[PDB]
């Protein structure tokens, strides 16, 4: 600490680099494709938002594809003292994302709560959909843990890019939805 | 009972050892004729306290011009070994500077192993008459324990691949840190 981004450097200068060097060649094959896409497309498209829990009904999803004004018209429902993971779900298109992470603000009535931030990582451009799973970790529970709050999410990464930002409500219940 | 899958990635200043470290451990020799600038993906059979673990070896390029490309091996990988040559005190330097500051970011709760090569060099009279030149000697053991522990590392360890020597105490540790994780979550 503290940690400098890297230097700007398309994919297409990093395969020059050191152009005949097997060993190295074959580096870079191994973590960049084997890719084409509309060169009108985001660099980075995070697809949905995932709840993985053995104890929840079912799987919960935040699309991420939609109108993100619609997440301020309803809530989520949270059983309290339960434990999860998240799922992020993203594509990458042309270049490197260099060290993409999901910073989350947790309010309650205009007053910050909880700072959580996630380090997604750095991913090169494929056609398959990327998958991201958060360490396990546990829902609050009590009087004062247990009702609704108001999340600010965002995803950035080493560059200052906001790839999205959308805000949504919580709620933390005794039980589930159903 | 089926074999563990950990994910080890080596890191380090260029040409300090880190090729060669995970050739030798991978193949019990020591590559003298031709040394690949980075070493395909070896997954290597190893048994550490009576579990048996596949350790999926995953070498890098630490030049600067890949700071952006090397960071993709990142990402789920269970125990890393940040290395440092004992004949370069610079290398030593870039620990707490480049790697560490590199190595926490992309890996926020990865158990990191301070891995001493090139130890045979240590009392090496060629080694020293150059180091000298700079006011510069071999790193102490001593050097290298107190940068582990300021880097809050898992442990210290130094090994020679030339002579094949610590190698498997080292991989055996960095199995061991892989092999293991109050509460955590939105409090
Ligand atoms: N004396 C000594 N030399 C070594 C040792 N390991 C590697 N070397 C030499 O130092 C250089 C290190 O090369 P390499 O491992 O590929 O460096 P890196 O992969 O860029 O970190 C090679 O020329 C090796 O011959 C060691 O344990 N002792
Ligand atoms: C206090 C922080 C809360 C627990 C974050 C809750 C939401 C997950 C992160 C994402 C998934 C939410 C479901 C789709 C409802
Ligand atoms: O979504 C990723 C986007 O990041 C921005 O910084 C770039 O200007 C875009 O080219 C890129 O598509
Ligand atoms: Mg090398």
Redesign the interface.
């Known amino acids: 600490?503290?940690?400098?981004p890297?230097?700007?450097?398309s994919i297409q200068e990093?395969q020059e680099?050191?152009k005949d060097?097997?060993?190295?060649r074959?580096?870079?094959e191994?973590?960049?494709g084997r890719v084409s896409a509309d060169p009108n497309v985001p660099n980075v498209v995070v697809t949905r938002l995932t709840l993985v829990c053995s104890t929840a009904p079912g799987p919960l999803e935040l699309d991420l594809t939609g109108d993100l004004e619609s997440f301020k018209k309803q809530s989520f429902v949270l059983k309290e003292g339960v434990?999860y993971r998240i799922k992020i779900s993203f594509r990458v298109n042309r270049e490197?994302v260099?060290?993409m992470k999901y910073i989350?603000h947790?309010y309650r009535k205009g007053v910050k709560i909880?700072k959580?931030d996630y380090?997604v990582?750095?991913?090169?451009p494929r056609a398959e959909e990327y998958e991201?799973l958060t360490?396990m970790?546990?829902?609050?529970k009590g009087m004062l843990?247990r009702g609704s709050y108001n999340i600010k999410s965002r995803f950035t990464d080493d560059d200052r890019t906001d790839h999205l930002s959308w805000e949504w409500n919580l709620t933390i219940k005794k039980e589930w939805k159903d | 009972m089926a074999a563990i899958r950990k994910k080890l990635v080596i890191v380090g200043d260029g040409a300090c050892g880190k090729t060669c470290l995970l050739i030798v451990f991978s193949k019990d020799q020591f590559p003298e004729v031709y040394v690949p600038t980075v070493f395909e993906n070896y997954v290597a059979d190893i048994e550490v306290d009576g579990k048996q673990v596949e350790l999926a070896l995953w070498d890098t390029a630490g030049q600067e011009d890949y700071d952006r490309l090397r960071p993709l091996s990142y990402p789920d990988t269970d125990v890393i070994l940040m290395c440092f040559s004992i004949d370069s005190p610079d290398s030593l330097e870039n620990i707490p500077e480049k790697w560490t500051p590199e190595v926490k970011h992309f890996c926020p709760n990865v158990p990191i192993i301070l891995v001493g090569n090139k130890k045979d060099l240590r009392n090496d009279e060629h080694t020293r008459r150059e180091l000298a030149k700079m006011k510069q000697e071999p790193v102490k053991p001593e050097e290298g324990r107190d940068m582990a522990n300021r880097i809050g590392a898992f442990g210290y360890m130094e090994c020679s691949a030339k002579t094949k020597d610590g190698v498997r105490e080292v991989f055996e540790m960095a199995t061991r840190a892989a092999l293991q994780a109050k509460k955590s979550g939105c409090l």
């Open positions: 600490v503290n940690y400098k890297p230097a700007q450097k990093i680099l050191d060097d097997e060993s190295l074959k580096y870079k191994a973590l960049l434990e490197i260099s060290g989350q947790t909880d959580t380090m990582g750095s991913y090169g991201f360490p970790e546990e829902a609050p843990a």
